[PDB]
Amino acid sequence: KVLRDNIQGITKPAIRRLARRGGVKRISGLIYEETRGVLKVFLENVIRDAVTYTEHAKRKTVTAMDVVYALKRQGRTLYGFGG
Amino acid sequence: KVLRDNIQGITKPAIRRLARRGGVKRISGLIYEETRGVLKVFLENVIRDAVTYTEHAKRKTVTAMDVVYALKRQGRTLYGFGG
Amino acid sequence: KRSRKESYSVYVYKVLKQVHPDTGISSKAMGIMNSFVNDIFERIAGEASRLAHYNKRSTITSREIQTAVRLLLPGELAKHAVSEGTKAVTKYTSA
Amino acid sequence: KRSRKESYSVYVYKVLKQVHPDTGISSKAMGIMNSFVNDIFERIAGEASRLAHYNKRSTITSREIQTAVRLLLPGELAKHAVSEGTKAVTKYTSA
Amino acid sequence: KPHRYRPGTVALREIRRYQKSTELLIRKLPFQRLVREIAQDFKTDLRFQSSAVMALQEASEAYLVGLFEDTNLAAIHAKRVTIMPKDIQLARRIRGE
Amino acid sequence: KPHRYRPGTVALREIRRYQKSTELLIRKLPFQRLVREIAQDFKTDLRFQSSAVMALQEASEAYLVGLFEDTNLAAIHAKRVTIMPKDIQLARRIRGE
Amino acid sequence: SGPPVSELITKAVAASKERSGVSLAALKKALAAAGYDVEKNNSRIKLGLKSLVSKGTLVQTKGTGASGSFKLNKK
Amino acid sequence: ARAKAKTRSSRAGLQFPVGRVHRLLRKGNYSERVGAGAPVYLAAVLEYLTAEILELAGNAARDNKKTRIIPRHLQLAIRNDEELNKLLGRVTIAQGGVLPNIQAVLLPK
Amino acid sequence: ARAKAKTRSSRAGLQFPVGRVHRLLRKGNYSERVGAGAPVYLAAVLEYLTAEILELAGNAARDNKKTRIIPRHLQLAIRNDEELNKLLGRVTIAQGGVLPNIQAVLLPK
DNA sequence: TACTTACATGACAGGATGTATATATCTGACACGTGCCTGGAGACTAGGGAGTAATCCCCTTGGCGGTTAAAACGCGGGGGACAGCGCGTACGTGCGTTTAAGCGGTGCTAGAGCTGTCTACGACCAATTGAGCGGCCTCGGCACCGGGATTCTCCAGGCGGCCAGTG
DNA sequence: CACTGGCCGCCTGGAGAATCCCGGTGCCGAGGCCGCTCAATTGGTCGTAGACAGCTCTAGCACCGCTTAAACGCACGTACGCGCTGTCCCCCGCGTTTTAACCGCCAAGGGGATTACTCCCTAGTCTCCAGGCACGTGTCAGATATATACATCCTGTCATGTAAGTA
């Protein structure tokens, strides 16, 4: 029930696949851990917002509405999840 | 009555001092005409909407409030003129 | 027993059939269409509301939304939306 | 005389005299403070209005504005503004 | 002698594949675990709708896609092809992060 | 021999002056002429508040100043100190314009 | 003190004598292995290379000036 | 004793619901009053935008020779139109991927 | 026998107007109904933000040996607090100029 | 200094495999028929927001003379960009292994969500006022002008390495 | 191979210049005062929004067993950054000349703003009715699987330029 080191769960080839979809030929080795950190900070932002939406809603389960709405506020609007 | 060339009205030393406020130590020679065009495009985006505000209000006089609204709709909000 | 959840299914369905008699749609593309029309409606409605507040107008007319779609919709889409909306209010007032 | 143009002038002047007895203010700085209070009021009120719509709530209360502070205001600014919000509302409920 | 491609063409075949294809690029379970780990630090005992987890999945992949396009522009700006930490720092700082 | 400063030194003093200074850097009435020229392209014979022209001038200076912040960042990104049109285009593209 | 670095450059180019000429970085690392403070003597190595090319004792393989590759003469 | 109900969607000749757009405008709380022509104009704009993007989606799907449009087709439609890309610059389409755009230096030779 | 007209800002111990912010919530048309503690809280947040930024403005004025706040002091107070900077990243101060910052590459050795 | 020869390199063909192309299948995802009831709608009405007529004044536009600060242009020159070129590494790519993601199945439950209650809560209306705003007025903080130090910057001369000369 | 004097790269002091700092002085915007009015207040009333309680049900979490796809680690490799230097050229700095921006001063009038009138329209409510969504089902488009065919990428081979070895 304790979760300790899940930032390493976003594997290095997963980052390679992400950069391939973004259109990258070559990825340095220093890239993976800081993109883990950057994505970490990004989820800190959006999940902090969604947690505030959640505790404002007096529910205990984070929903897709809270996700898409938190992305919507930050100029990162997402389609396809009931918005 | 008609005006043909005020793009050169934003002189090269004016662009120089703008970039000096911008922290630019050295400016290429090809910068000035491009920034004149870029400012012209930015003013297209602002002034077209500011005009649309004015004949939305059926006014002939362009007001500072319309300019403030047009800037803040682009997310480039200007303080000091509202009210 | 269930509660009704509103969507923009049938309208997008009739439009896609009208512009393409033979072409179908997936469910996820339908969700993205629902999200798109909701987003555009909220943008135009918010900008119309702000235009209403800025000239101290408590009413929203087609002039207000015309101003808004002139603000948001870039270039050629603006004049085409002006054309269809003008024709639409033309048939609405004539009937 | 003309129509009165509302401002936040004497209010910000009282705040300055409370925080800095000997420091003055300029008129352009006061216009920027009017722009500040109007902009922050606009941001908080707009996001809290959307929060009211999202939970299908007809009421905006101190809870919605508090949550809006947690979204918009960063970090220690957020939690301190929460602290003075709670002291203000407890003083108001105690009249 | 067994076949071996020169460096780069496997990368471009990947480029064409995952730009042509659409599917999710992060393994779903460790992403879900990372999200639960982060949300545990903010408010305790959170559960997640599965659709919310895939929503963070799509949004995170697209966010990284936008960043990696920006770092691609930064790298080709700097006469390079291999991106560096200062490229992501530039992209975030120009965008205002 | 008359006294003579090296290049960039006067530029650096100009730098520290213009972040030290607060006044407008665009000439007022030529900017008024430019904004009237742009305005008459949309609606002819428009009239301007002087405060509106000053607000447009302040916003234009703000836009260009922030644009050259990003441009200077992109220039030092490419190990250069003199900005180029590709720096401006890069900053404008990454910003989302 | 010791000898001047012209003998150092000749020793650095004569240590290997591979198919192409030796580059500036390789000869500087060679003098570092032989022992010299090359950090404050970059223009020294530049003038040594340019001077030794100009006398014709050194022939430059592909590069220009102090850049590129340097190889020994015919005899 | 009463006239037959005939919708303003049929009055304007637009398949988008005038009544539903008016209801969402009233309950989206944007003004105290809304003029009757405003939802008609808004629904016309909405139907034009949907018709144009669905036209591009159907054309792109026919280009992929597939009779049903998918989110990939929506991404291909949106990113290939400069005015739609201006309208949807910061908007993300789910499971649509990205437009194939390889920079010119990335190609070999 | 009507009571004395007391003010809600003084009731809450504030300087910013509870009444005017409440009226602007009613007239900004943001909800049909507004909770009573909401304008008090919003005025508290506004007064605290203005209190910190005026405190930093007075401190910057005392730093520049000026007894009066100039908009340059306001811009220096915004940009020297990184959290206030993140609050107001997109907002430009009139006549504030820009914060003095030179990249270290630009500076000579 | 020309003769000869082997090696780097461009031109051209060929295999292998990854991708493009053709055909079966089956399945579940799309699409269509039903019930329905909820959301749209038509008539009437109370009433108000906005459209329109009039004015005035003031704030914008237009115009003229003077100053000079800002611009424009040329010379000069340094520094900035950048092309090239080895080097050295730092990922790219292939291949075998671990394993953990993924899929399929089962069970619990906790929380999401719907529905009756009602009570706190907030908006609304008549009357009343006192704090905030428009205007005026004064004056001293501050803008501007004038003079002396200081820091900064750049160059003249002066020292150390060094490179050429010599014994 | 050691001694040694001149020549270039670097250290240092000093002169001029831009700015900092110290005064004086006049001024015009900041602050303070006064009249006013209008917007906040208060108290009763009335309708109602959401908190609460409780029930139901459903999807989210946990557990488990296979089952490979992929994560991973290692090894060979090559290609990419990139540090450095040489070379060219481009833009800052400064001086002089030009010129229009600013000021400031004055005329005039265009429309912004305000007030008044009056009515167009729009929201509300009872009633009615029909369209789109849950629900269910059926059914072929496309994913998958399998079998062909070309593209292309690497590699092998031929021709050739060219540097090297050589008489």
Numbering used by the authors:
A (entry chain b), B (entry chain f): 20 to 102
C (entry chain h), D (entry chain d): 30 to 124
E (entry chain a), F (entry chain e): 37 to 133
G (entry chain u): 35 to 109
H (entry chain g), I (entry chain c): 10 to 118
Q: What are the paper's exact sentences on this?
A:
The H1 histone is present on nucleosome 2 in all four structures, and is also observed on nucleosome 4 in all cases where this nucleosome is structurally resolved. In all ten focused-refined maps, H1 shows three DNA contacts, similar to what has been described. In nucleosomes 2 and 4, the entering linker DNA is in contact with α3. We found low Δβ values at nucleosome 2 and Δβ values of less than 6° at nucleosome 4, where H1 was always observed. The distance between nucleosome 2 and the nucleosome stack increases with increasing NRL, which leads to increased mobility of nucleosome 2.
Here, we report cryo-EM structures of human H1-containing tetranucleosome arrays with four physiologically relevant NRLs. H1 binding to stacked nucleosomes depends on the NRL, whereas H1 always binds to the non-stacked nucleosomes 2 and 4.
